[PDB]
Ligand binder design. Structure first.
Ligand SMILES: Cc1cc([C@H]2CCCN(C(=O)c3ccc4ccccc4c3)C2)n2ncnc2n1
Ligand SMILES: [Mg+2]
Ligand SMILES: [Zn+2]
Length: 341
């Protein structure tokens, strides 16, 4: 068994110093997708250690090693919503911790919940979205469609199922009150990853940003955790152009595969999921303008040190404008043939 030897080494070899992963591992310029997948569970432990969660919460090391491997194992391999996505989202949470002084805004247990939620937030994703669950009358829709956020409820339920697996409950020494709090936070934070939920609370986020963050305001904590989660989830867009071009490839491969399935079901896919209609530069510009940029502008409004993130996302949006002309075929194709007509 592969997990078992992986577990044995994770537990008995000791936790690698976070600096040994990469020289700018803690920088907003680092691209966590550069880390070999085989190295990621140890990197999770290193980040947990560096944020002092292992010692502060007296987390059992065998239990933690098992949990981390179980969470990794709990992801399938669609083009985008896979473990490397969850790992990179988790890494960005770590970056927020290291760069933005979250301890001035949030409780320790909230920051811990955010990170664990990042690890778990897309568990068992099947490469299709909430709309598809309903349209395809999936088991997940049968369970959760009446509440909405079908996939996100599933990701949360999967997280709980991992904790309820013998040897994997990293929280089971917590007080009943603290345990209840952690699982409630995980619920809220994972459900916040539904972009429909983000769009619903957007005005509230703006309102919070304009009056000013009040650390004594419980609703402000809740709003901030949502914004931070969303910021982690979309953080691929805060990297260099090469990263975001690759992530566009992954997203649309996943989306177009769904679209093909919808067509086969006799359903007309959304344009962004229809490989015959989707014009990727215009779609990406739309995503950046209408969704990503305002999120990181809000983050900047709240945390001035986050300015560079917004600036990157803005820069990436302008890059799509710049390359768009390359999507139109001028001259002949390289084979000199018009066969594709
Ligand atoms: C890091 C990142 C993550 C994502 C998606 C992840 C899954 C959910 N997403 C959507 O439902 C969604 C919503 C609105 C959209 C509008 C225009 C184009 C695409 C859209 C996609 C976002 N995209 N999509 C494009 N670039 C991304 N970059
Ligand atoms: Mg998700
Ligand atoms: Zn995600």
């Amino acid at each position: 068994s592969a997990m078992d030897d992986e577990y044995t080494k994770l537990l008995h070899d000791g936790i690698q110093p976070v600096a040994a992963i990469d020289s700018n591992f803690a920088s907003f310029t680092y691209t966590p997708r550069s880390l070999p997948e085989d190295d990621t569970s140890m990197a999770i432990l290193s980040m947990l250690q560096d944020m002092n969660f292992i010692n502060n919460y007296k987390i059992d090391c065998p239990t933690l090693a098992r949990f981390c491997l179980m969470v990794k194992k709990g992801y399938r391999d669609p083009p985008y919503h896979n473990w490397m996505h969850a790992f990179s989202v988790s890494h960005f949470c770590y970056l927020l911790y290291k760069n933005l002084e979250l301890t001035n805004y949030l409780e320790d247990i909230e920051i811990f919940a955010l990170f664990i939620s990042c690890m778990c937030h897309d568990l068992d994703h099947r490469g299709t979205n909430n709309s598809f669950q309903v349209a395809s009358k999936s088991v997940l829709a049968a369970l959760y469609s009446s509440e909405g956020s079908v996939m996100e409820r599933h990701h949360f339920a999967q997280a709980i199922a991992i904790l309820n697996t013998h040897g994997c409950n990293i929280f089971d020494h917590f007080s009943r009150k603290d345990y209840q709090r952690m699982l409630d936070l995980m619920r809220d934070i994972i459900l916040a990853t539904d972009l429909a939920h983000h769009l619903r609370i957007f005005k509230d986020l703006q309102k919070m940003a304009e009056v000013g963050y009040d650390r004594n305001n419980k609703q402000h904590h809740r709003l901030l955790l949502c914004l931070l989660m969303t910021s982690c989830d979309l953080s691929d867009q805060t990297k260099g152009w090469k990263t975001t071009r690759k992530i566009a490839e992954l997203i649309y491969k996943e989306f177009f595969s769904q679209g093909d399935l919808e067509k086969a079901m006799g359903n007309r896919p959304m344009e962004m999921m229809d490989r015959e209609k989707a014009y990727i530069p215009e779609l990406q510009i739309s995503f950046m303008e209408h969704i990503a940029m305002p999120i990181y502008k809000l983050l900047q409004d709240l945390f001035p040190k986050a300015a560079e993130l917004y600036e990157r996302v803005a820069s990436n949006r302008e890059h799509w404008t710049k390359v768009s002309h390359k999507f139109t075929i001028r001259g002949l194709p390289s084979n000199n043939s018009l066969d594709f007509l």
